């Protein structure tokens, strides 16, 4: 009866989808996905994200047909113009979507809402992706909180205002001729370049995008894995963390459903006085809270590395990209990143601070490489991550923190099984040395079949030299900004 356009972007799911639920509650729906590369500009998504999105759109397309509707796809030069044509052809009186918080989407969402309103069309946006909107949390005088622990302590002293919605019985279709709105198939979107297919063959075997695969993954994690998360999450190899990140990034599983499941387990385990389980749930929910926090700092705080004397050496960049640094944890991480499109958070910390602190590579280079190879590449989580390793955030790493590989290995890969899996050249090293083989007695290297420079790279920088260059780099950063 009432006709409503449902504009999908990063909410590729049916369950607890507020915009889709509101539209279906009012009448018939026209779901559409509008792709405008020129409007994404600086933040056009990378190879791994575009591969994932393409698989997930086809998954969602199938889901919407079975429900009695469809997903229309439009590659356009202008999002407003494509939406205005969908309105002209179908006759709908309203556009709904789930709003996003990245600067491109904020501005574009604002531009759509202003134009539709002046053209006499109703528009409404909905919180599809957060437990707490970025403006709901503030202190005693009403300002941002500027610290994760304080932000999360304040969040747990409030309740969620978000309200989960039940799924629709049927979707009432609105049909339009593909030719009247310049629509196309998923392959005509160009999400995947011909030259990318060989790399993307690794991601195909490793992952199945799509909201129904997210539900399967969330159920298996909650029901069998959350209990041990406090212990598993401290190792970087094997079964460590939930693997939910790509699905959360594309909205394929609602964070309100993630939290409900984990919180209810936490309450069960509190009653069973199962304290290890309560810790796990608590630690896992803190991860969710970091993701809320990433939106919160990107929405409220409108760079202390401004004057850092980066060594723009494209050769040592290649050596970082290829895992030819000679630091095992770093070289393992970059291999895992290329072959699976994902890595453990601590390996993300190690690899990124190695680029910045040991190599003095410009941080935008490592970000842009992450942006092209991570399935879960997410602007706000990535910003927060680089802020955390660069000392640009209250409770993070300090900029002069030079982590010792020997201690990182003992903490996060205490059996050495991460090195032995990704760097089999090193697998015969006693686990005592496997994370810093340059300190081992030459007799041990030789008994273990390691020859630095021939079958595993020599350290591309010495830690003691790196600490000196980093201290100089910091002095000149601080001397310079006082001088300018």
């Amino acid at each position: 009866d009432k006709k409503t356009i449902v504009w999908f972007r990063r909410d590729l799911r049916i369950e607890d989808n507020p915009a889709l639920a509101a539209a279906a509650h009012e009448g018939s729906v026209f779901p559409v996905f509008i792709w405008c590369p020129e409007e994404e500009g600086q933040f056009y998504p990378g190879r791994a994200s575009r591969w994932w999105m393409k698989q997930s759109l086809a998954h969602l397309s199938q889901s919407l047909k079975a429900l009695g509707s469809d997903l229309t796809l439009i590659q356009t030069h202008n999002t407003i113009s494509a939406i205005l044509d969908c309105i002209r052809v179908t006759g709908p009186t309203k556009v709904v979507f789930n709003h996003l918080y990245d600067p491109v989407s904020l501005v574009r969402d604002h531009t759509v809402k202003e134009k539709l309103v002046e053209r006499g069309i109703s528009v409404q946006s909905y919180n599809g992706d957060l437990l707490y909107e970025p403006w709901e949390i503030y202190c005693e005088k009403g300002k941002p909180f500027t610290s994760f622990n304080s932000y999360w302590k304040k969040c747990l002293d409030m309740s969620i205002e978000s309200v989960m919605l039940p799924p629709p019985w049927r979707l009432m279709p609105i049909t339009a001729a593909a030719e009247a709105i310049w629509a196309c198939s998923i392959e005509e979107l160009g999400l995947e370049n011909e030259a990318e297919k060989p790399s993307n063959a690794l991601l195909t075997r490793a992952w199945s995008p799509g909201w129904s695969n997210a539900d399967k993954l969330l159920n298996e994690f909650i029901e069998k894995q959350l209990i041990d998360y406090a212990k598993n999450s401290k190792k970087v190899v094997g079964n460590s963390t939930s693997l939910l990140s790509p699905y959360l990034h594309f909205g394929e599983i609602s964070v309100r459903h993630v939290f409900q499941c984990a919180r209810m387990k936490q309450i069960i385990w509190a009653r069973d006085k199962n304290s290890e389980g309560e810790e796990s749930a608590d630690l896992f929910l803190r991860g969710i809270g970091l993701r809320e926090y990433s939106r919160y700092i990107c929405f409220n705080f409108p760079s202390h590395l401004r004057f850092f004397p980066w060594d723009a050496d494209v050769d040592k960049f290649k050596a970082w990209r290829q895992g030819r640094t000679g630091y095992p944890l770093v070289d393992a991480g970059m291999r895992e990143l290329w072959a699976t499109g994902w890595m453990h958070n601590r390996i993300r910390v190690i690899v990124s601070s190695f680029g910045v602190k040991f190599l003095l590579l410009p941080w935008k280079w490592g970000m842009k490489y992450f942006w092209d190879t991570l399935l879960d590449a997410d602007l706000e989580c990535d910003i927060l991550g680089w802020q955390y390793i660069s000392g640009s955030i209250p409770d993070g790493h300090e900029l002069d923190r030079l982590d010792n590989p020997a201690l990182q290995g003992a903490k996060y890969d205490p059996e050495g099984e991460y090195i032995r899996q990704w760097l089999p050249e090193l697998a015969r090293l006693p686990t005592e040395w496997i994370h810093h083989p340059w300190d081992a007695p030459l007799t041990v290297l030789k008994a273990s079949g390691v020859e630095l420079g021939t079958n595993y790279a020599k350290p591309i920088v010495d830690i003691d030299t790196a600490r000196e260059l980093l201290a100089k780099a910091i002095s000149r950063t601080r001397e310079a900004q006082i001088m300018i």
């Binding site: 600067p103 501005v107 693997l243 699976t340 899996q421 089999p424």
Partner: protein
């Protein structure tokens, strides 16, 4: 049919130690060029405020 966690486990075991990272990335030519005024536009201030008001 196998779970995602186990599909990733299997793939990890198949490819680990056996996949070279290509010698060319494809974006080398952009390195030296590599702004963040995306977060400080007048437009984004207006949109943030508009988004708060409509909630």
């Amino acid at each position: 049919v196998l779970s995602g966690r186990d599909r990733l486990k299997r793939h990890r075991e198949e490819v680990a130690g056996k996949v070279p990272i290509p010698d060319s990335w494809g974006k080398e030519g952009l390195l030296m060029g590599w702004f963040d005024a995306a977060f400080t536009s007048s437009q984004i201030v207006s949109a943030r405020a508009a988004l708060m008001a409509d909630s």
